[PDB]
Amino acid sequence: YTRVVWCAVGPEEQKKCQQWSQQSGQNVTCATASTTDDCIVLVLKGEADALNLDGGYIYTAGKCGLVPVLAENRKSSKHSSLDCVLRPTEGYLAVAVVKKANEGLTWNSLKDKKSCHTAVDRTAGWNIPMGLIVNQTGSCAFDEFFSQSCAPGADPKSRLCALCAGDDQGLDKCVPNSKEKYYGYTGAFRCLAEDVGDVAFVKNDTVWENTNGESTADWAKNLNREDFRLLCLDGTRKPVTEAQSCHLAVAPNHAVVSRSDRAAHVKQVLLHQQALFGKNGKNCPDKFCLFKSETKNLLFNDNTECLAKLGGRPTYEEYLGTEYVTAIANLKKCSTSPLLEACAFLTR
Amino acid sequence: YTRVVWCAVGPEEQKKCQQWSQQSGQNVTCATASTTDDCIVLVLKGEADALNLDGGYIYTAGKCGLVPVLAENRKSSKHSSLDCVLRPTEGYLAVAVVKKANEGLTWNSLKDKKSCHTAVDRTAGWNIPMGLIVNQTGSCAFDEFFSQSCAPGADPKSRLCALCAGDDQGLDKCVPNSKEKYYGYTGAFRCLAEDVGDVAFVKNDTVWENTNGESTADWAKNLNREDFRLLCLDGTRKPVTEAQSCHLAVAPNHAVVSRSDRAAHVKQVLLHQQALFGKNGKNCPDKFCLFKSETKNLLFNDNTECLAKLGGRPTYEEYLGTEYVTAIANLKKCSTSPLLEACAFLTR
Ligand SMILES: *[C@@H]1O[C@H](CO)[C@@H](O[C@@H]2O[C@H](CO)[C@@H](O[C@@H]3O[C@H](CO)[C@@H](O)[C@H](O)[C@@H]3O)[C@H](O)[C@H]2NC(C)=O)[C@H](O)[C@H]1NC(C)=O
Ligand SMILES: *[C@@H]1O[C@H](CO)[C@@H](O[C@@H]2O[C@H](CO)[C@@H](O[C@@H]3O[C@H](CO)[C@@H](O)[C@H](O)[C@@H]3O)[C@H](O)[C@H]2NC(C)=O)[C@H](O)[C@H]1NC(C)=O
Ligand SMILES: *[C@@H]1O[C@H](CO)[C@@H](O[C@@H]2O[C@H](CO)[C@@H](O[C@@H]3O[C@H](CO)[C@@H](O)[C@H](O)[C@@H]3O)[C@H](O)[C@H]2NC(C)=O)[C@H](O)[C@H]1NC(C)=O
Ligand SMILES: *[C@@H]1O[C@H](CO)[C@@H](O)[C@H](O)[C@H]1NC(C)=O
Ligand SMILES: *[C@@H]1O[C@H](CO)[C@@H](O)[C@H](O)[C@H]1NC(C)=O
Ligand SMILES: [Fe+3]
Ligand SMILES: [Fe+3]
């Protein structure tokens, strides 16, 4: 079994993964589930080997005994010296984003507003904001804080899914995959853009990448980053240019996880797939580009330069950092997740 | 070591080999094992010298350090001028064959149909089809693709062996030798003919040789090649007459393999045995015919005119060709062979 089985979340990821397999000569093959949690179960059971996860999902994989292998790396501010694969990773910036023409809306007037979330359990979409809201209100009732939300992966019957749109035909509302119109960094921003929500919980990069002709998609085509502001924790609003002083927190980068027994194999194969199909890939763009989709962050973020090595011998705890682990642990006391309950005994 | 020890797969091949030995004055001697893999292990151990193999099996022999000696050669379309032994080899046409009266069945509707295979690891039976299926689906789960199969050599407990019938008393179901009813080119076609399966993976020649009174066997006696069609890769069906435009791939011809140290010896001896017992053999048909069995392609294909010389100094790679080698290597990423694991350990 030299093939590395990649877990694709949803049918759009599955098409890119099938492409990847064909061009990889089955050095990579595809399993699919409708959700990230399902894919974490596939890797647990050895029906799949790996997938690239948001840090919040890495927490779930970690509790279930999976390990981080390689981290997403985007273009930094300084070094063009060190190779991308050896270059220190820079955490992305979790921001709350509002329309500039919705004056009166601050961090402190968020209660019973409409929210857009990348999905439940994701770092910028959910762990960071809802962690802060629960901590500030001293209440576990984050499910009643917003009047209405789109938070893919929530209970589809609840107000947390009220604003989710699903497919073109409106099927699979609130399913935490890319077939849901408002799923992900893209989808949550599109949710704020089409004014379905008052606030979107996304990362700094998402705002830039979908404004001022930077995206070619018809909803994002004619968007100006002047029509948007960033809610800061100090109550103030600011332009999207001052993310560095107006962000909720710094997220650890999306990273690949595997079973321990498969990590070395998965690492070696990916370093080589990156060399062939990465940013400066021998076979990118004529054959296949690993880090490009229909600008819909399939398998990897489209802004991924390469997958980088980590420190020596890292656990999910070391990778995410003690602080973000404690913030997650605390928010999770207000909830139960099936996978966290199922796997709880492994790290207790 | 002037004796050439021939490896016979199964007891029917052993009877023909013993006959051959007797008539050869022990210029040829017989070893037997129950499977082709077992026979390749005998040659590895020096407990035998040689046998005639399908190209897929030649890949396994090759990885275990064996070399090709002489190729099967059947009647071509053009030259009756050049001697058979000097005449370029053409190589056979791997086809998917259906009943014409199973309308709706194309290459693209094959999933969870019933399949018939010559055996696991054979070129037309397995490598070509399952290579294409795995590449198209981007999945290594070829074992779950068909609902049920007969693929001799598969796990006898699995669905890949579900349709295999064994011997007349039903013993040794799925054993990859001629005692299994649906073993080989003949057996896989008989599997389609008796409607045990919806598709058979065989070569062009097998269809012709068992239809329109061409075979005298009771299952093949009353078969019309109008009641059969060829699945093409472009989705279309076609008559068995247009194999040239409706084939999965071109297979390298079955060929004799030996240890490197034994190739020249085995070559010299066989050229002479062919002269005595081949198609226009001095002693064929009054004493012994090397290229005739009880219509069971024993040791050699019955459609073999002679064994032909190869180009100067060919490896298994050069003989099978870079493209078919790549296809095999890629399908083998989805599997593990103990024999290939052992041989990697003891060729390095
Ligand atoms: C699919 O994966 C295989 C397995 O890794 C890839 O082929 C392998 O590529 C490596 C690295 O380039 C080769 O290693 C080389 O060894 C030679 C010494 O013989 C050295 O000169 C090179 O510097 C390098 O270390 C290796 O030959 C090769 N392995 C095999 C088994 O073929 C292949 O590129 C991948 N294909 C795709 C489409 O991803
Ligand atoms: C917030 O997100 C945006 C989008 O990722 C970040 O803007 C990016 O900033 C970097 C500098 O750190 C720019 O990199 C430059 O790339 C060009 C070539 O593309 C090159 O000429 C320079 O050498 C440099 O490396 C990048 O262009 C820019 N992206 C966009 C679309 O404006 C920004 O850094 C993030 N903000 C914070 C505070 O982290
Ligand atoms: C698919 O397989 C069939 C069966 O092997 C092939 O048909 C065979 O074609 C050969 C050579 O073209 C025929 O030989 C011919 O024999 C006559 C005299 O017997 C001679 O005048 C010709 O010059 C030629 O040598 C052979 O009889 C025929 N066999 C049958 C049973 O039909 C067919 O060629 C293969 N298809 C492709 C596309 O390769
Ligand atoms: C696998 O399929 C794709 C398209 O279907 C093709 O481009 C690729 O070369 C195929 N691989 C092989 C080994 O044929
Ligand atoms: C057997 O081999 C010897 C030695 O090469 C040769 O002279 C003889 O003609 C052969 N006999 C048969 C039956 O092939
Ligand atoms: Fe994230
Ligand atoms: Fe064959």
Q: In percent, how much strand structure appears in the residues of chain A?
A: 15-25%
Largest binding interface between chains: A-B, 16 and 14 residues
Order of helices and strands of chain A: EHEHEHEEEHEHEHEEEEHEHHH
Count of discrete domains of chain A:
2
Q: Can you tell me the overall shape of chain A?
A: globular
Give a short account of the largest sheet of chain A: 7 strands, mixed
Bound molecules: a molecule of 3 linked components (NAG-NAG-BMA), 2-acetamido-2-deoxy-beta-D-glucopyranose, fe (iii) ion
Oligomer: homodimer
Alpha-beta classification of chain A = alpha+beta
| Count of runs of 4 or more consecutive helical residues of chain A | 10
Number of beta-strand segments of chain A:
13
Using only C-alpha atoms, the radius of gyration of chain A works out to 19 Å
How far do the termini of chain A sit from each other?
32 Å
The helical percent of chain A reads: 25-40%
Organism (chains A, B): Bos taurus (Bovine)
Domain Transferrin-like (chains A, B): 4-333
GO cellular component, one term (chains A, B): early endosome
Family (chains A, B): Belongs to the transferrin family.
Entry summary:
Chains A, B: It is found in: Secreted; Cytoplasmic granule. With 348 residues, chain A is α+β, with helices and mostly antiparallel strands.
Can you walk me through this structure?
- Two copies of one chain form a homodimer.
- Chain A is globular.
- Chain A has two domains: 2-73 and 255-316, no CATH class; 74-254 and 317-327, no CATH class.
- In chain A, the strands form three sheets. In chain A, strands 5, 6, 7, 8, 9, 10 and 11 form a seven-stranded mixed sheet that branches. In chain A, strands 3-12-4-13 form a four-stranded antiparallel sheet, sandwiched between helices. The first copy, chain A, has a two-stranded parallel ribbon with strand order 1-2.
- In chain A, strand 1 (4-9), helix 1 and strand 2 (28-33) form a beta-alpha-beta unit.
- The first copy, chain A, contains ten helices and 13 strands.
- With 348 residues, chain A is α+β, with helices and mostly antiparallel strands.
- The two termini of chain A are 32 Å apart.
- The interface between A and B is medium-sized, with 16 and 14 residues.
